[PDB]
Design a binder for this molecule. Structure first.
Ligand SMILES: CCCCCCCCCCCCCCCCCC(=O)OC[C@H](COP(=O)([O-])OCC(O)COP(=O)([O-])OC[C@@H](COC(=O)CCCCCCCCCCCCCCCCC)OC(=O)CCCCCCCCCCCCCCCCC)OC(=O)CCCCCCCCCCCCCCCCC
Ligand SMILES: CCCCCCCCCCCCCCCCCC(=O)OC[C@H](COP(=O)([O-])OCC(O)COP(=O)([O-])OC[C@@H](COC(=O)CCCCCCCCCCCCCCCCC)OC(=O)CCCCCCCCCCCCCCCCC)OC(=O)CCCCCCCCCCCCCCCCC
Ligand SMILES: CCCCCCCCCCCCCCCCCC(=O)OC[C@H](COP(=O)([O-])OCC(O)COP(=O)([O-])OC[C@@H](COC(=O)CCCCCCCCCCCCCCCCC)OC(=O)CCCCCCCCCCCCCCCCC)OC(=O)CCCCCCCCCCCCCCCCC
Ligand SMILES: CCCCCCCCCCCCCCCCCC(=O)OC[C@H](COP(=O)([O-])OCC(O)COP(=O)([O-])OC[C@@H](COC(=O)CCCCCCCCCCCCCCCCC)OC(=O)CCCCCCCCCCCCCCCCC)OC(=O)CCCCCCCCCCCCCCCCC
Ligand SMILES: CCCCCCCCCCCCCCCCCC(=O)OC[C@H](COP(=O)([O-])OCC(O)COP(=O)([O-])OC[C@@H](COC(=O)CCCCCCCCCCCCCCCCC)OC(=O)CCCCCCCCCCCCCCCCC)OC(=O)CCCCCCCCCCCCCCCCC
Ligand SMILES: COC1=C(OC)C(=O)C(C/C=C(\C)CC/C=C(\C)CC/C=C(\C)CC/C=C(\C)CC/C=C(\C)CC/C=C(\C)CC/C=C(/C)CCC=C(C)C)=C(C)C1=O
Ligand SMILES: CCCCCCCC/C=C/CCCCCCCC(=O)OC[C@H](COP(=O)(O)OCCN)OC(=O)CCCCCCC/C=C/CCCCCCCC
Lengths: 47, 95, 50, 185, 50, 99, 221, 99, 65, 136, 145, 209
C-alpha cells in the first residue's frame, strides 16, 4: 500500500528518470564477462 | 557428443571440392544479391581495417624480426611440449 | 527473396501478400517436383548429346 | 441465400440492430492475439512431441522433420534468420489496429501507395510534418559525458503548462544541441 | 533507428477481400442491393443509381 | 475538404493491412538461437576439457591465469578481492588490443 | 467506365440480351449518352443537411488532447511470467546445490526476494494498464451520451425533411423513367428526357449563367 | 538538388566544432519565466476562475457550443432552441466575437 | 520513401551525384566515443498525455462514482 | 487470397518477358531474374486529401466566425493571421482547391447544358405528352 | 513397453556383451535424480508463489494510490520531471518554432495542378494576381507546435 | 530413453506390428520401406539442446558459487575477525549483486520488457507492417477520444434519425403530388402535372424493420 512499492513501475519510468532501462544492460554484460573470466580461473587448476 | 569417426578413405571436403565450391559461391552470390549496398559496407570498413592492422602489426608479426621478440606465448608451448612428453613416458617413469 | 539471407530487395515482393494456388507443403511437394523435372532435363540432354 | 444472410435482422428493429451489432460496449482487456499465439505456438509444442519419435533409423526421422518443416515454412516462408517475416492471412474486423488508430502516419504507411510524379519528390505536406521534431529521452549512458554528468543532475518537476508538446526532453533532430552526437541515418 | 530484432517473425494480413462472409469485410449492402437490382422491379433503375 | 483539407490527390488504396504479430514464443526461439551462438563462443574459446598439453587454447588460458595468481606473492592485497577489478580494468586498456 | 450499373440497366442487360451484331450493338451504347448526363445532373442537386448530425466536428478544441489508446501488453506479461517460471525451474533443477552447498547460500536466501520483485513489476504493470483501460472505456461512454443529448435538436431542423423529400422525389422520378423503343437510338428514352428535365428544372434555374452553383457542402463527385 | 536542403525563415547559429554539425544557439533568444513561475501564475488565474467565475457558466457554455456549428442558420437554430432564444449578435458580443 | 511517392533509381546511399554521403561509423574507439547509433526505444510519447486522465477523475466525481 | 486483379505493369530484369496478365489464370510468382510486378496486389484507386495543420485550421475558423458576425470588411487582421501562420504548402493547397472546384463547376455545368438541351425529337413536348408508364 | 523385433539379425548375448545394453538405464537414472530435485523443491517454490499471492493484494492498493491519489484527484502518476535547465527548455521551444518555419524549396509539382489553359476552354477565364510581398511567416502559439 | 518415447511406444504398438513384423521382413519395395521406417529406440536420439542446457547450467553454476562465496564486508569492519587490513573490502558484494541481477537476464530482454512498449517508437513500426516511419510519428495523432466517442455518437444519432425518417415518409405519403413537388422546390419552377402512374410506397426494399 505504501509508496515505496511505486519503484516496481516500468510503464511510466520515462516520467521520472528512464535510467533503469539502460543500466541493467551493462550489469548483464558485466555478469557475462565475470562468468567467462572467473570460470576460467577456478576451473583451470585441474591441469 | 563423441568423436565423429569417419569410415571412409578420404575426407568429406576433399571428395566434394567441386560441390562445396558451388554452395560456397552460391551463398556468396546469395549475400551479394541480397546486399544491394555492398559498396557502402566496403567503404565503411576501410578505416577500421587500416587502423587495427597498423596498430597490432608489431604485437602479432612485427615482433618476430624487430625490436623485441616477446616470447611469452612460446614459453608456454615449450612447457606443454615437455609435459606432453612426460605423460608419454608415465609408464616408464613410475615403473 | 525467400531463399536470400538478409535481403534488402524490399520492393521485390518482400512486403506483399503472396499466396498461391498450388499444392501446399511446398518444399515437400512442389519444389521437389521442380528438381525431378530438372534431373530429367539433364539426363535426357546427356543421352541425346552423347 | 441472399435472404438467409438477412435472417437475424428481420426479427429485430433498427434500434436493436444498432445496439446488438454496432454499439458493442468497449472492452479492451481481452488478449485477442491468443488465437495466433496458440496456433503458431503449437508448432513448437508439436516439435517437443515429434522430436521423440521412436523411429529407429536416424534418416527416417530426417524425412519426418523435413515434412514437418514443410508445414511450418508455408507460413514462415524464409528459413534463414533475420531475413524476412512469416505470412499469415488474418480476418478483417473492427478491432484491427484498434490501439494505433490515433496515429496518422501508421494509416498512411498501411493504406496509401502514392503515385510519383515528374517532379520526383515526397509531397511537401509530408516532408513538413516530418520535420516537426519528435521527443527523445535525455537519459543516455551510451555517451560517456552524459554517463558521468547525469549522475549529478537534479530531476526537477516539470509543471504542466496545458500543452501536449512540452519539450521536457531533447528533440529527435540531428541539429539539436543535445542530440548532435546521435547518428541519424 | 536501431532496436531489438527477432530472428523469426510473423506478419499478419487483414485482407479486405470482400468475398468472405466470415469477417466484417463482406459488403452486405453492395451484394444485397446488387442482387435486388437483378430482379425486375419498378425501382430497378433507382437501385442502380444508389 | 474545402475549408480544412488539402488538395484531392489520387493514390492507390492498399486493401491488404499488414501487422506484425506480437507473440511470446518468437522471443523464446530468438533466445534459443542466441544461446547456441553464445555456447559456441564458450565451446571454442572457453572449453578446457580435453588434453591440456596439446590444445593451445587451454595452454594459453591456464598458464596466463597461473601467471596472474602467482602475483599474490607481490603482497598487494587479497587477490580474491581485486581479481574482479583486474577484469574490469582489462576492458579499459584492452581497448588498445580490441578485447 | 463510371455509372456502370446505371448504363447496364439502361441498355437492358438486366432483362434481355444485346443484339449479336456490332452495328446495332454499338449504336445502343451511344444511345444512353444523353440519359447518363441527365442522371448525373440529378444526383448533383441534393440539398445540404447539418454535418454535425452523425459526425462530431474533428476541429473542435475538445479533441486537442491527442489522447492515445491505453493497452494491456498481454504478450509482454506472459513472456516475463514464463521467464520467471524459468528461474523457478532453474532453482528446482539445481535444488540440492542451492539448498545444501553453503557457497550458494546467498542465492538461496535472496532468490525469493528477487523473484517477488520480479513478480511485483510484472503484476504492477498489468494492474496499472488494466486500471487505465477501464478509466478510458467508462469516459468515452459517459462523454458520448452527453454529446448526444446536446445535439439531438439538430434532427428537428427542416433541412432534414427537405433532404428526405428530395430523395423520395428522385426515387419516384427514376421509377417513372422507362425505355420506350428498341431502335437503338437516343429517342428510345424520349419521354424519359422530359421527366428528368422536369426534375432538374424543379431544383435549379435553367436560365442562369451558372444553374449549378457551388457551395462548400455541395455535390461534385 | 541536394536531398538535405532546407529553407529556414528564422536566424540560427551553427556550431564550429569538429566532427559535429548542429544548431548551438538562436540569436536574441530570451528566457521567459521558469516552469515553476508559470505554474504559480496559472494557479492564480485558475483559482479566481474557480471561486468567482462559475456563476452563470451554463448559459455561456451553451452559447459557445452553438457558435461552433458550421452554418449560421444552424447557429440561430441552436441559440433559439437550446439557449432560451438568444440573439445572434447579442450572444456574439458576450463571447467576445464582435469588433 | 517509394510508398510515400518518390520513385527511386539505383540503390544504396553512396550518392553518385551532388549529395552528402553518410558512411557507417568507423569501428574504431575514436568515433565510437563521439557517436552512438540512434536508439529507437528512446523516442517516446510526451508525458503530457497522462494529464488527460485528469478528465477521468473529474468525470467520476461528477457521476458520483 | 484471391488472384490480384490483372495488371499489365511489370518491370523486367534479364530479358523482355512480354507479361500478359490475361494469358494465364493464376499469376505466376515473381522470380528475381525474370520480373517484378506492379505494387499493390490488392489495391484500388481512391482520392485522398492531406489534413491542414491544426493552427492553420484555427485561423480559418477565426476568420469565418469573424466574417459572419462582423462582415468581411472588418476581418483583415484575421486574414493576415492565415497568411502568416499557415505554412506555405498549406496556402498552395488552399489556392489549388479553389482552382479545382472552379474546373469541376464548369464541368458539371457543361453536363447540365447537354442534359437540358432539347433535342429535335422533343420539340414542343412537355410532361403532358409523357405516357403513363414506369420502368417495368 | 515391449519393442517389436524384426529379428533380421541375432542380438549379442547380454552376458558376453554387457556394455551394449547399459546406456538406456543410466539415462533414465539421470532423470530420476532430477525428479528428486523437483519434488524436494515443492515447498520453496510454493512459498514464493504464496508470497506472490499475498503481494498481489498490496500491489493492487498501491496502483490505485499511485493513479488516483489520496482524494481521487490523481496521484504521483500525474507527475513528470526533467533535467533540462530553463535555457534548455526555451531553446527547444524556439527549435520547435524554427522547424515550423522550415520549408522545402519548389513546393509541389505544378503539372499536377489545374491548368489555366484548361480553364479558358471550360468557360472560366482566370484572373492573374500579383505576389503577396508584404506577409511575414510566424510561428503559432506553443500549444500548436 | 525418456517417458515421452515410452508413451509413443504404447500408441504405436499396432503400428509397430504392421511395419516391423509384417513389412520389415518382406522383400522388394515393401521390405525396403519397412526396414527404413522400423519402430524402436532412436539411433542418434540424443537431444543436443537438452545437453546444451545441462552443460551451460553446470558451468554457470560453478561461477555462481565462486562469486557468491565471499568474505563479508561487514565482518571486516571491526578488525576482529580474519581481516585487519582489507583495502578492497568495498568490492566484496559486487560479484554477488551482479549474479543476483542475472536472474532477470531473460525477464528483461530487449526493449519491450523494460518499458511500456506502446509508448515507444518501435511499436509503431511493427503495427505498420515492419515499415519505417518518420521519427515524430508518435506525435502526429488524432485523439483516441474522438475516434471512439464519434463512433458511438454517430450510431446513437442514427437511431434517432431513423425515427424522424419514418415520420417524414409517412407525412409525405399523405401529401398531394402537387404538394410534394412544389414544396422545397425552386422559386422559378412552374408546376405541370405528370400522368398518374402506380408506384408502390416501400419503406425498406429488403424486408427489414
Ligand atoms: C535455400 C538454398 C540454400 C540452402 C541450400 C543447402 C546448402 C547447405 C550448405 C551446407 C553444405 C553441406 C554441409 C556439409 C558440412 C559443411 C561443409 C564443409 O566443408 O564441412 C567439412 C569440413 C570438414 O570436413 P572433413 O573433411 O570431413 O574433416 C576432416 C578433418 O577433420 C578436418 O580438419 P583437418 O585439419 O584435419 O583436415 C583439413 C581441413 C582443413 O580445413 C579446416 O580445418 C578449416 C579450419 C577452420 C577452423 C579454424 C578455427 C575457426 C573456426 C572456429 C569455430 C567457429 C564457429 C563457432 C564460433 C561461433 C559460434 C556461432 O579440411 C580441409 O581440407 C578443407 C576444409 C574445407 C575448405 C575450407 C572451408 C571453408 C568454408 C567452410 C567453413 C565456413 C566458415 C563460415 C563461413 C560461412 C559464413 C557463416 O568442416 C569444416 O572444416 C568446418 C565447417 C563446419 C560447418 C560449418 C559451415 C556449414 C556450411 C558450409 C557450407 C559451404 C560453405 C559456404 C561458405 C563458403 C565461404 C567461402
Ligand atoms: C622495468 C620495466 C621497464 C619499464 C620501462 C617503461 C616500460 C617499457 C617501455 C619500452 C619497452 C621496451 C622494453 C621492452 C619491454 C618488454 C617487456 C614485456 O613486454 O614483457 C615481456 C615479458 C616476457 O616476454 P620476453 O620475451 O621474455 O621479454 C623479453 C623481451 O622480449 C626482450 O628481451 P630482453 O631481455 O632484451 O628485455 C629486457 C628488458 C630490460 O628492462 C629492464 O631491465 C628495465 C631497465 C631498468 C630500470 C629502468 C627504469 C627506471 C624506472 C625508475 C625511474 C622512473 C622515474 C620517473 C619519475 C619519478 C617518479 C617518482 O628490456 C630491455 O632490455 C630494455 C632495453 C631497451 C633497448 C633500447 C636500445 C635502443 C633502442 C633505440 C630505439 C627505440 C625505439 C623504441 C620504439 C618505441 C617503443 C616501442 O613478460 C613479462 O615479463 C610479464 C610481466 C611484466 C613485467 C613487469 C612489467 C614490465 C612491462 C611489461 C609490459 C606489460 C606486461 C603486462 C601486461 C601483459 C598483458 C596483459
Ligand atoms: C488411457 C489410455 C489411452 C486411451 C485413449 C486412447 C485414444 C486417445 C485419443 C483420444 C484422447 C486424445 C486427447 C486429446 C483429445 C483430442 C481430440 C481431437 O479431436 O484431436 C484431434 C487431433 C487434431 O486434429 P486436427 O484438427 O487435424 O489438428 C492437427 C493439424 O495438424 C493442425 O494443423 P494446423 O496447421 O491447422 O494448426 C497448427 C497446430 C499445430 O499442429 C501441428 O503442427 C502438428 C502437425 C503434425 C506434424 C506434421 C507431420 C504430419 C504427418 C501426417 C500424418 C500424421 C498421422 C499421425 C496419426 C496420429 C493419430 C493420433 O497448432 C494449433 O492449431 C494449436 C496447437 C496447440 C494446441 C494445444 C495443445 C493441447 C494438446 C493437449 C494437451 C494435453 C495432452 C497431454 C500432453 C500431450 C501428450 C504428451 O488429431 C490429432 O491427434 C493430431 C495429432 C496430434 C498428436 C497426438 C499426440 C498426443 C496423444 C496423447 C495420447 C495420450 C498421452 C500418452 C499417455 C500414455 C499412457 C496412457
Ligand atoms: C529448432 C527447434 C525449435 C523448436 C523450439 C523448441 C526447442 C526445444 C526446447 C527444448 C527445451 C525445453 C524442454 C521442454 C520439455 C521437453 C521435453 C523434455 O524435457 O525432454 C524429454 C525429457 C528427457 O530428456 P532427455 O534429453 O531424453 O535425457 C535427459 C538426460 O538423460 C538428463 O536428464 P535431465 O533431467 O538432467 O535433463 C533435463 C532436460 C529436461 O528436463 C525437463 O524436465 C524439462 C523441463 C522444462 C521446463 C521448463 C520451464 C517450465 C516451468 C514449468 C511451467 C509449468 C506451468 C504449468 C501451469 C499450470 C500448473 C500450475 O533438459 C532441460 O532441462 C531442458 C530445459 C531447457 C532450459 C529451460 C530453462 C529456461 C530458463 C530461461 C528462461 C527462458 C524463457 C523461456 C522459459 C519458457 C518457460 C515455459 O523428459 C523428461 O525430462 C521427463 C521429466 C518428467 C518429470 C518432470 C515433471 C515436471 C517437472 C517440471 C519442472 C518443475 C519446475 C518448477 C515449476 C516451475 C514453474 C512453477
Ligand atoms: C516486519 C517484518 C519482520 C521484522 C522482524 C524480522 C526481521 C529481522 C531481521 C531478519 C534478517 C535481516 C537481515 C539483516 C540483519 C542481519 C544481522 C546480521 O548480523 O547480518 C550480518 C551478515 C553476516 O555476513 P555474511 O553472512 O557473511 O554475508 C552477508 C552478505 O552475504 C553480504 O555481506 P557483505 O558485508 O559483503 O555486504 C556488503 C554490502 C551489504 O549490502 C548493503 O547493505 C547495501 C548498502 C548500500 C547502502 C550504503 C549506504 C552508504 C551510506 C549512506 C548514508 C545515508 C543513507 C541515506 C539513505 C536514504 C535512502 C534514499 O554493503 C556494501 O556493499 C558496502 C559498500 C557499498 C559501496 C560503496 C558505497 C559508499 C560510498 C559511496 C558514497 C556516496 C556518497 C558520498 C557523499 C555522501 C554525502 C556526504 O551480513 C549482513 O549484513 C547481512 C545482510 C544481507 C542482506 C539481507 C537482506 C535480506 C532481505 C530483507 C529485505 C532487505 C532488507 C535490507 C534492505 C536495506 C536497504 C537497501
Ligand atoms: C538460477 O540460477 C541460474 C542457473 O542455475 C544454476 C542457470 O543455469 C543460468 C543459465 C541459464 C541457462 C543455461 C538457460 C539458457 C536458456 C536460454 C538462453 C533460452 C532457452 C530457450 C529455449 C530452451 C527454447 C524453448 C522453446 C520454447 C519454450 C518454445 C516452444 C515450446 C512451446 C511452444 C511449449 C509451450 C509452453 C508451454 C505450454 C508452457 C508449459 C510448460 C511445460 C514444461 C509444458 C511442456 C509440455 C509438454 C507436452 C512437453 C542462470 C542465468 C541462472 O540464473
Ligand atoms: C506462463 C507461465 C506460467 C507460470 C507463471 C509463474 C509466474 C507467476 C507470475 C504471473 C504474474 C501475472 C501477471 C499478469 C499476467 C496476465 C495474463 C494475461 O494477460 O493473459 C490472460 C489471458 C486471459 O484472456 P482474456 O479473457 O482474453 O483477458 C481477460 C483479461 N482480464 O489468458 C489467456 O488468454 C489464455 C492463454 C494463457 C496461457 C494458457 C496456457 C495454455 C497451456 C496449455 C496446457 C494445458 C492443457 C490443455 C489441454 C486441453 C484439454 C482440452
Amino acid at each position: 500500500i505504501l509508496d515505496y512499492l511505486f519503484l516496481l513501475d516500468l510503464n511510466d519510468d520515462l516520467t521520472r528518470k528512464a535510467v533503469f532501462e539502460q543500466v541493467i544492460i551493462f550489469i548483464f554484460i558485466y555478469c557475462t564477462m565475470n562468468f567467462l573470466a572467473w570460470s576460467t580461473v577456478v576451473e583451470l587448476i585441474w591441469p | 557428443g563423441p568423436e565423429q569417426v569417419s569410415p571412409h578413405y578420404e575426407s568429406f571436403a576433399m571428395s566434394r571440392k567441386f560441390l562445396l565450391t558451388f554452395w560456397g559461391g552460391f551463398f556468396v552470390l546469395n549475400f551479394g544479391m541480397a546486399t544491394v549496398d555492398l559498396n557502402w559496407i566496403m567503404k565503411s570498413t576501410y578505416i577500421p581495417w587500416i587502423f587495427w592492422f597498423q596498430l597490432m602489426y608489431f604485437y602479432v608479426e612485427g615482433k618476430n624480426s624487430m625490436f623485441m621478440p616477446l616470447l611469452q606465448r612460446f614459453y608456454r608451448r615449450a612447457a606443454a611440449n615437455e609435459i606432453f612428453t612426460m605423460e608419454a613416458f608415465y609408464h616408464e617413469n613410475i615403473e | 527473396n525467400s531463399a536470400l539471407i538478409g535481403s534488402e530487395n524490399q520492393s521485390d515482393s518482400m512486403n506483399e501478400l503472396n499466396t498461391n494456388f498450388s499444392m501446399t507443403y511446398y518444399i515437400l511437394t512442389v519444389l521437389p517436383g521442380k528438381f525431378i523435372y530438372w534431373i530429367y532435363e539433364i539426363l535426357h540432354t546427356f543421352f541425346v548429346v552423347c | 441465400d441472399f435472404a438467409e444472410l438477412l435472417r437475424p435482422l428481420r426479427s429485430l428493429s433498427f434500434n436493436q440492430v444498432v445496439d446488438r451489432y454496432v454499439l458493442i460496449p468497449p472492452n479492451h482487456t481481452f488478449y485477442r492475439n491468443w488465437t495466433y499465439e496458440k496456433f503458431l505456438g503449437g508448432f513448437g509444442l508439436s516439435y517437443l512431441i515429434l522430436r521423440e519419435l521412436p523411429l529407429r533409423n536416424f534418416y527416417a526421422r530426417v524425412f519426418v522433420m523435413y515434412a514437418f518443416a514443410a508445414k511450418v515454412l508455408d507460413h514462415l516462408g524464409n528459413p534463414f534468420p533475420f531475413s524476412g517475416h512469416g505470412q499469415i492471412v488474418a480476418a478483417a474486423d473492427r478491432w484491427n489496429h484498434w490501439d494505433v488508430r490515433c496515429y496518422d502516419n501508421v494509416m498512411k504507411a498501411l493504406k496509401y501507395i502514392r503515385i510519383p510524379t515528374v517532379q520526383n519528390n515526397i509531397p511537401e505536406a509530408t516532408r513538413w510534418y516530418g520535420r516537426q521534431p519528435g521527443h527523445l529521452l535525455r537519459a543516455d549512458t551510451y555517451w560517456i559525458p552524459n554517463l558521468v554528468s547525469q549522475r549529478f543532475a537534479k530531476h526537477q518537476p516539470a509543471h504542466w503548462d496545458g500543452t501536449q508538446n512540452m519539450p521536457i526532453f531533447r528533440l529527435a533532430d540531428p541539429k539539436h544541441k543535445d542530440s548532435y552526437m546521435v547518428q541519424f541515418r | 533507428t536501431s532496436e531489438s530484432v527477432l530472428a523469426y517473425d510473423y506478419k499478419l494480413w487483414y485482407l479486405w477481400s470482400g468475398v468472405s462472409n466470415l469477417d466484417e469485410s463482406f459488403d452486405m449492402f453492395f451484394n444485397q442491393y446488387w442482387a435486388l437490382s437483378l430482379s425486375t422491379s419498378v425501382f430497378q433503375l433507382f437501385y442502380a443509381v444508389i | 475538404t474545402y475549408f480544412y483539407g488539402g488538395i484531392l490527390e489520387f493514390v492507390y488504396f492498399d486493401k491488404s493491412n499488414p501487422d506484425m504479430c506480437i507473440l511470446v514464443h518468437t522471443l523464446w526461439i530468438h533466445l534459443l538461437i542466441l544461446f547456441l551462438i553464445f555456447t559456441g563462443f564458450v565451446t571454442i574459446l572457453f572449453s578446457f576439457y580435453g588434453n591440456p598439453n596439446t590444445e593451445e587454447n587451454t595452454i594459453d588460458s591456464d598458464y596466463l591465469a597461473a601467471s596472474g595468481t602467482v602475483e599474490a606473492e607481490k603482497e598487494i592485497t587479497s587477490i580474491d578481492d581485486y581479481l574482479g577489478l583486474v577484469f574490469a580494468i582489462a576492458y579499459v586498456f584492452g581497448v588498445f588490443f580490441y578485447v | 467506365m463510371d455509372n456502370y450499373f446505371t448504363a447496364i440497366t439502361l441498355l437492358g442487360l438486366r432483362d434481355q440480351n444485346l443484339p449479336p451484331f456490332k452495328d446495332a450493338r454499338l449504336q445502343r451504347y451511344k444511345s444512353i449518352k444523353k440519359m447518363i448526363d441527365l442522371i448525373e445532373t440529378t444526383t448533383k442537386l441534393a440539398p445540404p443537411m447539418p454535418v454535425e448530425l452523425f459526425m462530431l466536428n474533428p476541429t473542435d478544441p475538445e479533441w486537442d488532447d491527442d489522447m492515445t489508446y491505453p493497452t494491456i501488453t498481454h504478450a509482454t506479461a506472459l513472456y516475463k511470467s514464463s521467464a520467471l517460471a524459468g528461474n523457478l525451474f532453474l532453482y528446482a533443477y539445481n535444488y540440492n546445490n542451492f539448498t545444501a552447498n553453503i557457497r550458494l547460500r546467498t542465492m538461496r536466501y535472496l532468490f525469493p526476494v528477487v523473484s517477488l520483485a520480479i513478480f511485483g513489476n510484472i503484476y504492477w504493470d498489468y494492474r496499472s494498464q488494466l486500471v487505465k483501460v477501464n478509466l478510458f472505456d467508462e469516459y468515452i461512454q459517459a462523454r458520448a451520451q452527453e454529446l448526444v443529448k446536446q445535439n439531438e435538436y439538430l434532427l428537428e431542423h427542416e433541412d432534414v425533411k427537405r433532404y428526405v423529400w428530395w430523395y423520395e422525389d428522385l426515387k419516384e422520378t427514376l421509377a417513372r423513367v422507362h425505355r420506350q423503343a428498341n431502335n437503338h437510338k437516343a429517342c428510345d428514352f424520349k419521354d424519359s428526357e422530359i421527366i428528368l428535365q422536369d426534375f432538374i428544372r424543379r431544383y435549379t434555374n435553367p436560365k442562369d449563367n451558372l444553374p449549378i452553383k457551388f457551395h462548400p457542402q455541395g455535390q461534385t463527385f | 538538388m541536394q536531398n538535405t536542403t532546407n529553407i529556414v525563415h528564422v536566424p540560427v547559429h551553427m556550431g564550429h566544432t569538429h566532427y559535429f554539425d548542429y544548431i548551438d544557439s538562436f540569436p536574441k533568444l530570451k528566457e521567459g519565466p521558469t516552469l515553476e513561475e508559470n505554474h504559480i501564475t496559472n494557479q492564480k488565474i485558475l483559482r479566481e476562475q474557480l471561486i468567482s467565475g462559475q456563476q452563470g457558466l451554463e448559459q455561456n457554455l451553451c452559447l459557445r457550443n452553438c457558435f461552433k456549428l458550421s452554418q449560421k442558420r444552424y447557429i440561430e437554430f441552436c441559440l433559439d432552441r437550446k439557449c432560451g432564444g438568444a440573439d445572434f449578435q447579442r450572444a456574439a458580443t458576450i463571447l467576445g466575437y464582435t469588433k | 520513401t517509394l510508398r510515400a511517392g518518390k520513385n527511386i533509381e539505383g540503390s544504396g546511399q553512396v550518392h553518385f551525384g551532388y549529395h552528402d554521403q553518410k558512411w557507417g561509423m568507423p569501428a574504431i574507439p575514436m568515433f565510437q566515443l563521439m557517436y552512438y547509433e540512434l536508439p529507437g526505444n528512446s523516442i517516446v510519447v510526451n508525458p503530457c498525455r497522462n494529464q488527460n486522465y485528469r478528465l477521468y477523475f473529474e468525470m467520476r466525481k461528477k457521476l458520483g462514482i | 487470397a484471391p488472384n490480384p486483379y490483372p495488371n499489365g505493369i511489370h518491370f523486367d530484369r534479364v530479358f523482355p518477358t512480354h507479361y500478359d496478365p490475361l494469358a494465364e489464370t493464376n499469376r505466376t510468382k515473381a522470380n528475381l531474374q525474370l520480373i517484378k510486378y506492379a505494387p499493390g496486389n490488392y489495391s484500388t484507386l481512391v482520392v485522398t486529401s492531406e489534413k491542414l495543420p491544426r493552427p492553420c485550421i484555427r485561423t480559418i475558423q477565426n476568420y469565418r466566425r469573424c466574417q459572419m458576425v462582423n462582415g468581411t470588411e472588418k476581418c483583415n487582421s484575421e486574414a493576415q493571421d492565415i497568411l502568416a501562420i499557415c505554412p506555405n504548402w498549406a496556402l498552395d493547397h488552399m489556392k489549388e482547391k479553389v482552382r479545382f472546384y472552379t474546373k469541376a463547376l464548369a464541368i458539371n455545368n457543361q453536363t447540365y447544358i447537354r442534359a437540358m438541351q432539347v433535342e429535335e425529337y422533343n420539340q414542343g413536348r412537355t410532361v403532358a405528352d409523357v405516357a403513363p408508364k414506369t420502368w417495368i | 513397453p515391449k519393442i517389436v523385433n524384426p529379428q533380421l539379425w541375432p542380438n549379442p548375448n547380454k552376458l558376453r556383451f554387457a556394455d551394449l545394453y547399459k546406456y538406456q538405464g543410466v539415462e533414465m537414472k539421470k532423470i530420476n535424480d532430477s525428479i528428486k530435485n523437483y519434488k524436494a523443491a515443492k515447498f520453496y517454490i510454493g512459498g514464493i508463489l504464496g508470497g506472490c499471492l499475498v503481494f498481489k493484494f498490496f500491489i493492487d492498493a498501491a496502483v490505485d494510490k499511485y493513479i488516483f491519489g489520496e482524494n481521487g484527484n490523481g496521484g504521483k502518476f500525474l507527475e513528470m520531471q526533467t533535467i533540462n535547465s530553463n535555457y534548455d527548455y526555451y531553446y527547444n521551444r524556439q527549435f520547435q518554432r524554427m522547424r515550423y518555419l522550415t520549408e522545402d524549396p519548389a513546393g509541389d509539382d505544378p503539372l499536377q495542378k489545374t491548368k489555366d489553359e484548361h480553364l479558358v476552354d471550360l468557360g472560366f477565364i482566370p484572373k492573374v494576381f500579383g505576389a503577396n510581398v508584404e506577409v511575414r511567416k510566424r510561428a503559432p502559439h506553443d500549444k500548436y507546435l | 530413453m525418456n517417458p515421452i518415447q515410452k508413451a509413443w511406444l504404447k500408441i504405436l504398438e499396432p503400428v509397430s506390428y504392421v511395419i516391423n513384423e509384417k513389412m520389415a521382413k518382406r522383400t522388394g519395395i515393401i521390405g525396403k520401406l519397412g526396414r527404413f521406417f522400423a519402430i524402436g529406440p532412436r539411433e542418434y536420439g540424443v537431444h543436443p539442446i537438452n545437453r546444451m542446457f545441462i552443460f551451460m547450467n553446470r558451468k554457470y553454476m560453478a561461477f555462481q558459487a565462486v562469486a557468491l562465496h565471499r568474505y563479508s564486508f561487514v565482518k571486516s569492519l571491526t578488525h576482529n575477525g580474519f581481516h585487519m587490513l582489507r583495502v578492497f573490502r568495498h568490492f566484496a558484494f559486487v560479484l554477488p549483486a551482479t549474479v543476483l541481477a542475472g536472474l532477470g537476464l531473460f525477464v528483461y530482454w530487449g526493449d519491450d520488457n523494460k518499458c511500456y512498449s506502446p509508448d515507444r517508437f518501435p511499436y509503431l513500426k511493427k503495427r505498420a507492417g515492419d515499415m519505417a516511419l518518420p521519427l515524430n510519428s508518435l506525435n502526429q495523432r488524432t485523439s483516441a477520444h474522438y475516434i471512439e466517442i464519434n463512433a458511438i455518437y454517430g450510431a446513437e444519432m442514427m437511431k434517432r434519425y431513423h425515427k424522424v425518417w419514418e415520420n417524414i415518409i409517412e407525412e409525405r405519403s399523405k401529401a398531394t403530388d402537387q404538394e410534394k413537388k412544389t414544396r422545397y422546390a425552386h422559386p422559378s419552377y412552374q408546376y405541370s402535372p405528370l400522368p398518374v402512374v402506380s408506384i408502390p410506397n416501400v419503406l425498406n426494399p429488403l424486408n427489414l424493420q
